[PDB]
Design a protein around this ligand. Structure first.
Ligand SMILES: *[C@@H]1O[C@H](CO)[C@@H](O[C@@H]2O[C@H](CO)[C@@H](O[C@@H]3O[C@H](CO)[C@@H](O)[C@H](O[C@H]4O[C@H](CO)[C@@H](O)[C@H](O)[C@@H]4O[C@H]4O[C@H](CO)[C@@H](O)[C@H](O)[C@@H]4O)[C@@H]3O)[C@H](O)[C@H]2NC(C)=O)[C@H](O)[C@H]1NC(C)=O
Length: 260
């Protein structure tokens, strides 16, 4: 099921997180002045790049992951082997994208250490996780893990692949109160005919979770649909193939462009 239009406040929030996600491809160029840039999350073997950030105006600790910026990352993006989410064994029968799992395990210890330190210094701040493309699925896996320790986790993804199986989607839907858009803490943002939310195919055992926020052109609050349930609709009905122009440009911002 679907409805058309979101609040300006929600729209501006999605745009803000899309900006951070797209700036992650260029050392967080031109992000708002209200954000303090913390430690760089990095592993050389997987070439996973991200940052922990803090916004004292919105009272959030933000973890952002860069999507693919190297052939090393591409090797992760294109590994569709499902694997048990063994870092979070309380996620029963949960399996995740095998490449993104390899990325996640390479940075888990650093991510968890940084979040723990910052949350201890700022205990009433929300914990927000975000990213685009590969970074979106890194954000999904990270948010799943964090949700088991912290009660105030929010996830904003852009052009997110199917990150795992239905068990994993269901775990995430429960953890992030996805059953109503009024309560959801998981905003799965899609754009027009972006091909990447169609991959890997559901036929290989993959599923999405979250409430889908489907941005149609010309982008605006009024032209963003809210898509709920597991019927084929919205981005996943458009037949987009792979990395197309819709994938690279969310709310008019192209990955790494730095013209915002
Ligand atoms: C795509 O993603 C998926 C999911 O993330 C990856 O699949 C996992 O891959 C790992 C690594 O191969 C695999 O782990 C093996 O499990 C076996 C048990 O079933 C182990 O026997 C095996 O041990 C060998 O490799 C380890 C190093 O990886 C060594 O520590 C160990 O000593 C063993 O070493 C022998 O074999 C290796 C490999 O032939 C050889 O190099 C050594 O010299 C020695 O002969 C692994 O631990 C998991 O089973 C996979 N999970 C699933 C669900 O399939 C996959 O690897 C990703 N693709 C890429 C390219 O990274």
């Amino acid at each position: 099921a679907s409805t058309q239009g979101i609040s300006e406040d929600l729209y501006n929030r999605l745009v803000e997180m899309a900006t951070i996600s797209q700036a992650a491809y260029a050392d967080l160029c031109n992000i708002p002045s209200t954000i303090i840039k913390g430690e760089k999350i990095y592993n050389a073997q997987t070439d996973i790049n991200g940052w922990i950030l803090r916004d004292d105006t919105s009272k959030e600790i933000i973890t952002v992951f860069r999507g693919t910026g190297s052939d090393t990352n591409l090797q992760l993006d294109t590994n569709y082997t499902l694997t048990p989410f063994d870092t979070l064994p309380q996620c029963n029968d949960c399996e995740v994208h095998g490449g993104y799992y390899i990325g996640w395990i390479s940075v888990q210890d650093q991510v968890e250490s940084l979040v723990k330190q910052q949350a201890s210094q700022y205990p009433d701040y929300a914990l927000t996780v975000t990213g685009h493309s590969l970074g979106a699925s890194m954000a999904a896996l990270t948010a799943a893990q964090l949700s088991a320790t912290y009660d105030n986790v929010r996830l904003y993804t852009f052009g997110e692949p199917r990150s795992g199986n239905q068990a994993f989607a269901s775990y995430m839907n429960d953890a992030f109160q996805v059953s109503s858009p009024e309560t959801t803490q998981y905003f799965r943002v899609t754009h027009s005919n972006d091909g990447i939310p169609n991959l890997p195919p559901a036929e290989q055992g993959y599923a999405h979770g979250g409430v889908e926020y489907w941005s149609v052109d010309p982008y605006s609050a009024q032209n963003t649909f809210v898509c709920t349930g597991d019927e084929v609709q919205c981005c996943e009905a458009q037949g987009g193939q792979g990395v197309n122009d819709a994938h690279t440009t969310y709310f008019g911002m192209t990955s790494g462009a730095c013209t915002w």
